[PDB]
Amino acid sequence: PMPPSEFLDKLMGKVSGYDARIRPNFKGPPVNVTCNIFINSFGSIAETTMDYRVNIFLRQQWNDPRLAYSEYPDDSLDLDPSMLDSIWKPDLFFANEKGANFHEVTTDNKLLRISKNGNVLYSIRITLVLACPMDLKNFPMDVQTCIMQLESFGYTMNDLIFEWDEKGAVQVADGLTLPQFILKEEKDLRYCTKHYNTGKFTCIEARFHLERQMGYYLIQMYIPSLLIVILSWVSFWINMDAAPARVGLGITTVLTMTTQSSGSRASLPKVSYVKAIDIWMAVCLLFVFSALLEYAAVNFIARQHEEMRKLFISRAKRIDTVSRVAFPLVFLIFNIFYWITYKII
Amino acid sequence: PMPPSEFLDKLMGKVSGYDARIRPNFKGPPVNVTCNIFINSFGSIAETTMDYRVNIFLRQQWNDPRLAYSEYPDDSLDLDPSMLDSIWKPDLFFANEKGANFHEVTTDNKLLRISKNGNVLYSIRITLVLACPMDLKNFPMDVQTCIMQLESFGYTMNDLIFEWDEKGAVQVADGLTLPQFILKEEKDLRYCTKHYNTGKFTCIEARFHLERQMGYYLIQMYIPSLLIVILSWVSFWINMDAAPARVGLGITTVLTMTTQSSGSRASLPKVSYVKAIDIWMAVCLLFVFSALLEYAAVNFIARQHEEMRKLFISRAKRIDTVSRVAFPLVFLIFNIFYWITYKII
Amino acid sequence: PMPPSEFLDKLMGKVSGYDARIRPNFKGPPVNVTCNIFINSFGSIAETTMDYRVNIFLRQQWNDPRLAYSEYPDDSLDLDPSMLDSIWKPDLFFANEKGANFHEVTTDNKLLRISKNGNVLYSIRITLVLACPMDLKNFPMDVQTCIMQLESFGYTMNDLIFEWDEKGAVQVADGLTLPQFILKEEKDLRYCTKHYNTGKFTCIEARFHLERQMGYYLIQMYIPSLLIVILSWVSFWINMDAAPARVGLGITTVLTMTTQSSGSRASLPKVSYVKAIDIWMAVCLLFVFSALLEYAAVNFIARQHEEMRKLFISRAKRIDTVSRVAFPLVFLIFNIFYWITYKII
Amino acid sequence: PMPPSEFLDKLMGKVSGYDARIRPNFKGPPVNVTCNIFINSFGSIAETTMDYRVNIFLRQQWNDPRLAYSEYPDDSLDLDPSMLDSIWKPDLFFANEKGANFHEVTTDNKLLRISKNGNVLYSIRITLVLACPMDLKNFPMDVQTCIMQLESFGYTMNDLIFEWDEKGAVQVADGLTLPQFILKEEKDLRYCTKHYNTGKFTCIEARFHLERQMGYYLIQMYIPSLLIVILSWVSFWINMDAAPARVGLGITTVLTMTTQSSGSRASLPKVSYVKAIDIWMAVCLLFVFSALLEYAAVNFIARQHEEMRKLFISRAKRIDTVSRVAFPLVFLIFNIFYWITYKII
Amino acid sequence: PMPPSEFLDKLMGKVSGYDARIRPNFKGPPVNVTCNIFINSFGSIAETTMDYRVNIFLRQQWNDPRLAYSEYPDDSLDLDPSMLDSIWKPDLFFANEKGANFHEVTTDNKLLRISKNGNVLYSIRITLVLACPMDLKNFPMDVQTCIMQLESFGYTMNDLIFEWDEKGAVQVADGLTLPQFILKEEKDLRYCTKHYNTGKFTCIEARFHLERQMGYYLIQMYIPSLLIVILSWVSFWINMDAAPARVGLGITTVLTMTTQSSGSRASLPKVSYVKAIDIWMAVCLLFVFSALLEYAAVNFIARQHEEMRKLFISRAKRIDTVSRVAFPLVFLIFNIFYWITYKII
């Protein structure tokens, strides 16, 4: 038997009229290409750039009746990647590429197997820098959906139709983690069917779900800002007449609330709208600011001038024992309404 | 009928004298090319680099009378992107590229349809790193216009003329957001007509409008610096003779004003001229600095030495009750004139 | 004798039927390729990206019986790297490339020696950006394993089998250090044998071990946060009635604990889960926060109103001498359980 | 008349002996090439890297007597950029490239016009990453000169001579700004004439001048550090015996001077030598440090022990009223000598 | 005389049997190549990456007896860089490339002159990203040696031998500075002679010396941390009984020592071991921490309870006048031993 590298040059040569610029079943039914991807790497999810890079194996399967053979004995051939330009291949591309390239190290990472009845299996290795828009209106408590869609560039719906295969359309590698997200093990597979002023093009997409982990922002940002609000409240139990003690506890509590918020903006993303962590640090700044405005009333009622001196110091102690109950209670109402409206979403 | 890949090699081959180095209507009227772009991605608007990257579909339409055909039955052909060098194409380029590339993943993302009367439709996919100059003299309250212009490189105005088409010249994709701006849904389409010492070249441009979002700088920078100025004012209601209380409230208020301004410069852009957020933090530093210079007068008039001791402590209380009205009032005048002169622009 | 550049063009030319698209021993036993790498550079271990770049010499050895020669006298030939496409080479690739390239400066850095019995030695120089997942649950006290695996792309296990050689499979260059790790001088060499829906492909891997150095985080982060907890404890020896001294020592100790934690997050990695350095800074924040809640009880029991005044000031001194022993003792229990549970791992 | 694309293939074909590897006027006088650049973009002036990127149109004009024609009627031809290798072009390069590339988007951005007497006009579009050394010994008050030189690589001075043209040798685009500099509208045009151990090569250069803007460093760094030195001086007017007031005003003024200097190093460049802004923040730290050493003398003379108690408290008030004049006066002498020695440069 | 571009095609054509895949003096003595580099640019010395980029002219000189000519009159020819593949060139490469590329802007920056007796001069322009390991155990006081070695890839020592020339082997351009180092004007030139399991390959290297500048770390980090230790010592001269004055001077001195160390870690490199600047900031933290532990003893001995009250206050004044001498003296001993052990290295 003749070797398979020369049997393909007889099957696709100057004879038999095979042209790699003409789709199979030309002027007939469309070409049904079935696809599945295999994700090797995933991550570096940027929020300044709003993209994420991924490393996949793209497998494509179509039927080419011009490549059916019956003389050669073996059930499958394998075309070398140097001779790849002599095959009609689909013009799949990604609608949100934002940059992508092949892998060409030690061999072009390509693969092409032509079966006996003409089924063609074409697997390649691609690095993508896919773009997904992100909605950071509740930043530590958010789920980010990042799609991945696969259009056709030059053939319309009456010529070429993409499908996912019905047996494992998207697999993900096992030991694959992320620094700031987790990847849920459920994928949404649907169509999009892009229209233009050119024609109905085909496309298929796959959605992913990214639940952001929580435990860093509690230990570093929520719990330390929580304790500073508690330290604002020990002024109501410190003596009234200890005037350097109350205002030294006042501003130095709103200075460590300023340092806690300023030093943590370097770790946060730089979007220009208000988050959920931004309204925590703002309202917790308002409880520390309100503690010194309480003492500014106490240091003025009690200093105000026996009948009337007994009256005014009774009023400044009344405004103190009320606020021992009111400021933990009002802060507990905010601490309910905050976590309810951001866990329910 | 002969297949379309060989009908184009008869239409553009060694016969018929078609040369891809000669424009249509040579030594005649100019070539009218009509263009429209479709923006897929948009963002990473840098201010250190003063650029922005964008991902478009560039569609071009011209008429080539050498490519009119009448033997072949179908109304449109489609040239394969490998055979692209056998077509006269316009030398469009972007006058502010600053770097750009094509997309070549799984197929060269190109498209070329030759109609029956010779109308040629040429769509490609380009990633641009277009450069727009930015004017940050009022940084949180600003509108940034970033143009996008499309010159001709080697053909002058008497040979090649660019136009926008009169049916949707610039579309933008739907789910397309930005981290720090919003994109207004109105586009300005005009000419520029570049002159050189070479000749009148043609160009068309498209302007975009970028209103910067506000809500981050209020919650993180304006409102916290606002409250620190309020805490400077509780010293006028704290007792005069409480000398460690007044000056402990003094410097620790101008220390949390220093920390608020120093820790927020990391989030701001690094231009070397004065912004509108820079004059907020500077004038708000002058109100906290002025509160301790008030007490430096009070701690000197009252300490100055019955007739004359009653006189001087009456003067130090007079300078205190005036400033209880004056410092909220002067700060309210600045709070009017600031927001009027930066919302009117 | 004819020169070796023309003896290879006789050995691999149009005559003898040598085809570079057909593996040796075709339709026979598989091809046994034995491999060894030589690491020149190593480092830039990112944790945001979770990768590391490396610079190796990849040596491959296989036997090709089509390239055995006996007319030419010398024991070894050497094919020039321009004529490299006329040799069957294995399609080795790295399963976690994440980007890689060759070196082409002043010559393509390739090498190919064909021995007399057909043994082929193929050495190249590759820069890899290999991806390894990292587990930072105990950040200063951690060992990071980063693998390096070498699959086959198009030939299955019945056609091509990779091996390490039994004489020094992985060497590392001598003067090769890292900024944040040390590299242990022991390598684990094993198989992986990747399965797909395509076939059993071969792969070999090599594990490395990276013990993180310690001495920076002690001097910069553990010891300074240790001393701030000691300064919280000098309040129990300062007088009870010195009310501005106790609370000035209180908040300014929890302000320098806030500054110590905020200013050190810029040096730490930005994962979104809790580390071991994150629970040090959190629990050490709880001991400084607890010191002022101690004095809030002392300043309330002693102020509470001879028989009963002698009773209450005796109780506030009792709660002070207990806490002189209890807070160094409770902190020593945490200081045991922390370092035991993170040195035992 | 024959079309111009075939008239050039007759003018430069196998006939007439035109060789693109031989300069015009070979073994005769040198080739006089006249050059002018047109700057489109300018900026991203790095100081860590010490470079700046620029985007120019490089126009070159020389005379080639082999390309003179008289049969064809029109005064100018235009060679297509695909056929560019059939023309002798000068080997101009930039002596401080540090990286550069062409622009190849939608057409190679090249241009070549051969006049009737043989004058050749060759315009291209280049992105350069030119390197200029910077001298930051007085950082906010500095002028940076960044040159741009254009050598010849393989032809010496007796073969090829570069010139600027005498009609606008360097133009700059109109709406072109910088984030941290301004560009003066005067250019210095001179020669350099590089010598080596190879031969006298030609080169021309063009200098630019970059005056750094001022207004950011005044508002953010000079004026806030100025006001902290003023707050050190209100201790001399606060009472002597107010011991917690004086030292609370002392260290908290040198703490807000520490925060002002530490938080502003992130915005400054990271050179490893002393600037002019570095000696401002250092000497202004010495005036705040000297204010507390003044009170350390006052709190020791007055505490030192009627005749002798009247003597020592008279001496501690004498050392206070002297320093009310001396510290504004000594700081004003530094405030003169500083701004004189950095505006005169 | 025939033109030189055709005389080289006669000297290296199909006739005369010249093969560019065979070294000169084949099966004879080795090839003596003499080399010298000319450094144009130098810098961006990274410490996270541990590399540095450089821009050189690499000149190589060897003798090829196949290229000797005597018919043509002129003493030197010059081969055009398009025809470069018809010359045996040495396979020099850099053993620590870590990435490198050529320069191809406006012409390939190459040069090749064949003398009359066959001496070949080959100069090219290369941008290298050479890797040098750095030892930051004493960070502001260190000398960094970064080598640059030039191996041979495919020819062993019995075939090809590199040498430096004996007339200026390494020159450096004149106006060439660095942001954080200075470059000493002395170069070490030596051999390395790499051995492998392949053969004895040749290599030559050149060492450079980089003394780090000092003046930034004194003004920004050493002197400000020096003055904070002095402010710890003014508590021994402030009154004993001024209890809010002593502890307000205590923690606020160790807070400005925390801010001085935290805010300066952003400018320092991120190695994970202890530097010399790291032990300065740590020991200077121990002197400020020790000043408050001194007063914690004074505030307990003097408060401890006429005979015995006179005894204990005499002991608390004794422990104060000792420490007025001891803490400047112990700090001066550390200030000797530190600068001796880091200037002697």
Ligand SMILES: *[C@@H]1O[C@H](CO)[C@@H](O[C@@H]2O[C@H](CO)[C@@H](O)[C@H](O)[C@H]2NC(C)=O)[C@H](O)[C@H]1NC(C)=O
């Ligand atoms: C590609 O897939 C579609 C769906 O299987 C096929 O289209 C149908 O084919 C049957 C006959 O084979 C027709 O009766 C239907 O009218 C077709 N359309 C639809 C919507 O069902 C198509 O034949 C396939 N083409 C190829 C080459 O396999």
Ligand SMILES: *[C@@H]1O[C@H](CO)[C@@H](O[C@@H]2O[C@H](CO)[C@@H](O)[C@H](O)[C@H]2NC(C)=O)[C@H](O)[C@H]1NC(C)=O
């Ligand atoms: C390209 O567009 C312009 C405008 O439609 C055309 O120029 C005019 O054409 C008419 C006749 O067709 C002339 O009467 C006018 O004098 C032309 N100039 C102007 C300013 O109106 C031009 O013909 C078009 N060329 C092609 C090939 O379509």
Ligand SMILES: *[C@@H]1O[C@H](CO)[C@@H](O[C@@H]2O[C@H](CO)[C@@H](O)[C@H](O)[C@H]2NC(C)=O)[C@H](O)[C@H]1NC(C)=O
């Ligand atoms: C490649 O390596 C394997 C192992 O050495 C060889 O496979 C064995 O070869 C012997 C005879 O040579 C057989 O008896 C065994 O059945 C084979 N399999 C196993 C699992 O041991 C193989 O021959 C080698 N192929 C070449 C070309 O060298």
Ligand SMILES: *[C@@H]1O[C@H](CO)[C@@H](O[C@@H]2O[C@H](CO)[C@@H](O)[C@H](O)[C@H]2NC(C)=O)[C@H](O)[C@H]1NC(C)=O
């Ligand atoms: C290139 O420019 C120089 C200067 O114009 C020319 O060199 C001079 O040419 C004249 C005659 O044309 C001689 O008398 C001079 O001796 C030349 N040298 C100098 C220094 O003036 C040169 O001829 C020009 N070459 C071409 C091809 O135009």
Ligand SMILES: *[C@@H]1O[C@H](CO)[C@@H](O[C@@H]2O[C@H](CO)[C@@H](O)[C@H](O)[C@H]2NC(C)=O)[C@H](O)[C@H]1NC(C)=O
């Ligand atoms: C390359 O350089 C070496 C040293 O000059 C030469 O090797 C020596 O050549 C002489 C005769 O020319 C011999 O006697 C020596 O035995 C050689 N070896 C040593 C170590 O000295 C060599 O000839 C030169 N080769 C060429 C082509 O120039």
